[PDB]
Symmetry: D2
């Protein structure tokens, strides 16, 4: 055959169609070898050395597995080789837009460097996909294997970012709506991107994943829902789906939002902001970009990877001294110090536009405790983390279709009360972590008093160690006693 | 070179002190080789071939690991070799009282054969332990290794069943209270027995365990709580403790309370009740016992194992024809056919004694459908399942002591609201299963109509497939529409 | 009836065609739930609780996987669903003939109980398969799914035992010759039966296997070899096939031929020989058989399982006292004591007829050391184990066909010298284990002197601990110095 | 505790003493986060993203485990906390000297760039260890925790490189000789560095390790050998040690010497040779070094990592155009083309002195075939691979001390003949791989004819695909027929 075989520790032997190999063997795809999946998490979990490259091969493989399983069970769906290849390409290419240290780049750096711009890795993936196709002559290779480039490039982009704008899609009609639920599920978040990273991250972190995606694929069918053909899970798998979201949330709490992994991502972002005026990345026509402007030119963005960290760390330029000093503090493990964690008790989230006021509010708290050192706004980092089941306040399982054994092609709905009284009553919450840039004993003691007083003033939850770190502050709050 | 080493697929190489080897190499302990850990579960999960013997080795190993870890971090606890051996023996011996097919025996058979008696496997473990020690001359071997048999045999039994009767224990004092939390934790259920069966059952079932017992052991300390020294977990582990109980509940729903596993245990129990007049087990002085009376004589109970199933299946005695016919139907997979599952609404909490009228109630339902068949009491089985976090309505984490990094000796409490708003708001519920002894198509159609009608009449939850199995019944209930 | 799914810890979710489910749900197949895969090995490796039932499901699954992979890559082979079902059934039923404790029954017991008869589990499998088909009305169900029972039952039997008697097979012609190398490979022993047991045993034993059967299946094709169509492996897999046989031999050394596992199997076989005059097994028309004659009647053999061990252990019959006493010594761990291991030198090979003389020869040795104890022939057990690569003196890889990427259509041969100088120069050897029934220190000291002297007298290899156990004997042998 | 815990996917929770944390949190140690364990192997096995950093934590952990196990079983050894910390430091620090892409750097690049110098990663580890200690004020911290830096730094260096010059060591006396066998075993190569890499590489590559280092540690003791106390293994582990070397060889055959991973390392080395003049690395006093001279100054070497690859790939400088074009061909997968593999027969050995002449010899072969293209020396790469059991022609197991259970303090030697006739007769062999820098069809056809002709002329082994790639050449050699 002309298929290549790649051995992966998660999936075993992955067979790749020659069109997929041509897409993978490009500078635009190979770039993902130099972007860590968990960014700063590697500095907490040493097994987490994995890159977006191997995750992308796994997403492309699982996308192919699911569409083949549906076509084998229900030939009447008329799934073509063309459909299979287009779903695999979208799976392979949905991580193309990631920047240095993955979620650090679009979650922390671009918001602070370029607040005027609205940028996501998903839009990056669509722009990088266009640059990959056009720079490497892929459209004629697509046609050679039976694809229709105009329709199928549209279909691939829609699978990653949704409608580029009643059926809102142009790449495929309503009778193939199920194809859009495999790579990036906009309806309920159940997709092969999560299935790969749960298993891969768990393998590398040394933590346990409870989600059985092979069982899910075996039980998956397509059903009619409101004039669309969609993916329906077997009714009895509903508990396994609730457990999938519980697992996702558990992996966010223990690993992806680890308090020290997040501070290392914050310190790396700070070094990038201090380096951004001085690093030059050449793009199209020899034009020079910066870390923050390389997102505007895919030829420049192609060369923007975790390498930026080492380019700064190893620099001799006096201009890069400040950026270099922050990364040196990461190496000596002189990190900003974790003060504590709290949650809002209210139902209205802290909004992103309020994030910058929060350090001033902590510094404005007046703890009734003797303090030697006085801290300022600039001494505090306040990190707000949205934890949910992928749909804000909504239950994603209310947006899943199920079938029963007696009518395997008829969609039904299952409510939370039909499953268990032991499930969550709420599907979204915020975590607030506070850190201090002053690392001495006296500064950290003070930071704790300001923190717990701010919690009390804002009616947030009592920090788990509140009575130990702030014994004179916690008694003032009756809700805490 | 006095110790023996056993290779276990869960724990790797387990070292056993010579005293432990002498206890294991007895007819009373080796009997656990012939009792399946999951009983009827093996007939649904063919990986689940494992027996109570290998689970017991694991419990004794983990009990040793925890007591050694505590002694090591806190030498001021004065943990002795004597304390370590007594904890390991209680760990190895806490499963000794299990009968044929494990929880089938004390969960289904003894309650129906001997309703007057209050029998648990734990009381069995204490009686079997006494018989093991006395039949095999163990007390002199205990003295040889520094144990004081009067105090230490009391300690071992108390670790399994609790106070044999202000400090209610005689085996060890208040300053060693923590030792009583290792093998069977009566305060919150967090103990090494669960840690072994999560990891061992997951390995055999082919399902994944997320609980990292090694991490928990590494972070565990002893703290002063109300004039006792108790085990305190690091504050940061509180999320991992909620996950442990989530995993336990997930394993109950998927595996231990599998609808078909439960009906096979029900059919085996029915065969045992029909064989009980005829089967003989030889006990002390050649006296004959029955399946139901072997619990009264430890020499007889020693020979009461899963072998009873095959003695019935292979019998030629006409008296055993009815018992043998039930087991033959298991082999042909002619099982009582699953009709569906429902839940009580409100706080309707069947605490037992109504199990007898439930089949009559289903048959008394009047579904508004044309049926060719009419079924009665003898055609229905109704199973009640209590699902909880081990303490009925209570949150076990409210009964855990934590410590913080800044004051490792100060016990604190952590409430659900200090952890996450995404946790369960309830910790207990009931499931109701219904099955039909008639297996033909006409009888199964009728049984479905009676079932869904009964659910509607009792205001139970709508069965997940209700609209497909009973399309003419479901519209009568508006709460369902 | 539709597909069933069984969750297996080795293979994950196995889908079973309704015809396969009907074959599995019979007393003849379900019997395999009560036969331990590794027999006495469970008494050394407590993870090894697995039975022939779950191994058989795995063999049927892998047989399906390989035939599907060949048919997918080479549609010109004309592989039919009929062919796939027949291969799966042969895979499922190849273990049907196993007796109590698997290889102990046909390897040790039947040869000693019935030396006149030639019995193998393979012949048993064919007889049990015939009994299963005829007793359970399978033929009509076969016809319903497109099988032709006359040809296809012949084909199934030939896959298990070979030609029942130029092409020697009647079930399929030469153009489907490759179908006969999947379930039981008579040409080189590379088959799906080994692939399942390596992975299953390793998972249960707690030991690691290096054989990637998925990779092998991915690279497998069918090639013309001397006017047959045979399975050909990719050239690059030749190293992995040498490693497969090294792994098998390693698992035999560590596990299947463990010295203590083998002595437990020896003691069980002795108990069975002592019980054989007295145990009655009812077969067809109420005729009575013995353990050794149940092989003559499949209705009797259906009820001959590991249960016979417990029937003896729990017996009160004075006739069974001697048999029962041996099994009681196993429970107390009063086993015959391993003295040592040696090998014949040069090409010297001990014949089966001479096994019985070996205990007398050891007892006839004259150590030339002062002993207070004299041992007799009856005090020694001598176990002779033939270790090979499954074809006696032959290299099985000389009987593999390979293909290169430059010409997938040209079958080639690869010699040992084309692969590595680090491979074995011999493919068969014999190990001789000696054990002593007298366990006291004086008796074992003496047994050691007799053993090392016998080795010296026969010119066998120096036992590894020779100089320590027999320091006065080892210097007399110059070939050892 | 002031101990840190690191979660590792191979070892679980690793506890680190504060002195070890101070050594790890340095630029010299953290550098190992940017060196791939398997270099070019990542470009063949996408799971192999792991770096030397996490391997080094595992080696330090296992070194601790082994020394603690010996001290617990044999307190009379008088193993001190000082001994344990010195062994852990040597374990952590033995990989410090690795350069970019690990074995590529000292195996391929330095020998070609600086043929006059004799450099190994081991010498690098000692020089960087000295730089780490001196640059970061570690000597005072060592004294604070009871180390004596004069003796103990000597001891650490000797563990990595051997005697810095019959007891040849100065760091510890003969009665602690066993300490020198833990991190880098110069006597037989059985050490904790291999144990970590087998498990860690197998986990990432997705291939299986069968070496059980925990079992080995459990059975290890210290014995008297020629006035030294050395590590003695249990005699029964001799089979498992032969298997350890077999696994090592298999990992080299499949992974570390993969033909494509080796050609990618060759192409990276070629890019580094083309860039060596132009890349400037600042060392001590602002002096500038090259890639090839950074080994001369540890301040420069600290900044020499896999980053060099990306600095070249992302350069715009015309000086780096040639180097950059080689790396761009790697990204497009336009690699030098593998022609074939052969071996010298019997004891024939190619020495390093031969390596440069080999391409000319292949080009000098005169295949009797019509060729369109004529190839030159410059068009061929010839890679010579030494495969052995770590001691050239010698059997490492002849250099192991064993002990038997009858006398645990008596060291014994076990020969190959006392173990098995199925073991290797030879412990060293050579592979010769030939590649072509011309990648078109006509040049590859020609290269194959020259290669197979050269094999025939030198009496090398027939390439496995010889009959297919060179059907007109193979007939000249009758031994090849
Ligand atoms: N599990 C496993 N994977 C292997 C082994 N050898 C290589 N691989 C992996 C490395 C790659 O991810 C993948 C493909 O390498 P292969 O040696 O199968 O093919 P390659 O293209 O190098 O050779 P070819 O062009 O077919 O001659 O398989 C092995 O023995 N076991
Ligand atoms: N992982 C592993 N387990 C093994 C191996 N050989 C034996 N075992 C298992 C079987 C038992 O559960 C445990 C102890 O068996 P051994 O063969 O070490 O001890 P045995 O008592 O037969 O020998 P001994 O009394 O020490 O001469 O280890 C092996 O090579 N690998
Ligand atoms: N991995 C895994 N296996 C499960 C789970 N639930 C059941 N199994 C296993 C048990 C059986 O070997 C296999 C199929 O059992 P199911 O519960 O799917 O089938 P059952 O015949 O009870 O249900 P059905 O006839 O389809 O209503 O899967 C689960 O949540 N995860
Ligand atoms: N297996 C496992 N590892 C975890 C989990 N949370 C964190 N880790 C890993 C990350 C690190 O490699 C190691 C120690 O991390 P911790 O979060 O326990 O330590 P950290 O220094 O952040 O907390 P501390 O200074 O003790 O408050 O454990 C978890 O839930 N499970």
């Amino acid at each position: 055959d002309t298929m290549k075989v790649i051995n992966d520790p998660i999936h075993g032997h992955i067979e790749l169609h020659p069109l997929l190999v041509r897409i993978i063997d490009t500078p635009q795809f190979q770039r993902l070898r130099y972007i860590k999946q968990l960014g700063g998490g590697y500095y907490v979990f040493p097994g987490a050395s994995h890159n977006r490259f191997e995750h992308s091969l796994g997403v492309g493989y699982l996308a192919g597995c699911l569409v083949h399983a549906l076509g084998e069970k229900q030939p009447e769906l008329q799934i073509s080789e063309r459909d299979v290849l287009c779903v695999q390409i979208a799976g392979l290419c949905r991580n193309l837009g990631h920047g240095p240290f993955s979620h650090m780049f679009d979650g922390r750096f671009i918001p602070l460097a370029r607040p005027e711009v609205k940028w996501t890795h998903e839009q990056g993936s669509v722009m990088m996909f266009e640059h990959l196709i056009n720079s490497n002559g892929i459209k004629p290779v697509m046609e050679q294997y039976g694809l229709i480039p105009e329709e199928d490039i549209c279909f691939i982009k829609e699978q990653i970012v949704g409608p580029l704008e009643l059926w809102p899609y142009k790449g495929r009609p309503e009778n193939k709506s199920f194809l859009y639920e495999i790579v990036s599920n906009k309806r309920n978040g159940i997709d092969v991107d999560k299935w790969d990273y749960f298993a891969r991250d768990c393998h590398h972190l040394g933590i346990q994943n409870n989600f059985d995606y092979k069982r899910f694929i075996k039980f998956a069918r397509v059903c009619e829902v409101d004039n669309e053909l969609r993916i329906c899970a077997r009714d009895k798998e509903v508990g396994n789906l609730y457990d999938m979201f519980h697992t996702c949330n558990s992996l966010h709490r223990r690993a992806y939002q680890h308090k020290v992994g997040n501070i290392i991502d914050t310190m790396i972002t700070d070094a990038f902001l201090k380096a951004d005026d001085y690093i030059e990345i050449t793009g199209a026509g020899g034009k020079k970009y910066r870390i923050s402007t390389a997102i505007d030119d895919m030829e420049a963005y192609t060369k923007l990877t975790d390498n930026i960290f080492l380019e700064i760390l190893y620099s001799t330029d006096p201009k890069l001294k400040d950026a270099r000093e922050i990364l040196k503090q990461i190496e000596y493990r002189n990190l900003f110090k974790y003060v504590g964690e709290t949650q809002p008790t209210g139902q209205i989230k802290i909004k992103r536009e309020d994030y910058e006021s929060l350090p001033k509010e902590v510094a404005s708290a007046k703890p009734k405790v003797l303090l030697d050192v006085k801290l300022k706004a600039e001494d505090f980092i306040v990190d707000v983390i949205n934890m949910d089941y992928g749909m804000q306040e909504k239950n994603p399982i209310d947006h899943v279709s199920f079938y029963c054994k007696t009518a395997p092609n008829r969609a039904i709905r299952i409510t939370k009360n039909q499953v268990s009284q032991l499930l969550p009553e709420k599907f979204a919450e915020q975590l607030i972590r506070v850190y201090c840039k002053k690392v001495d004993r006296k500064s950290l003691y003070a930071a704790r008093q300001y923190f717990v007083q701010w919690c009390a003033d804002r009616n947030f939850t009592k920090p788990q160690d509140g009575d130990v770190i702030a014994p004179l502050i916690t008694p003032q709050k009756k809700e805490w006693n």
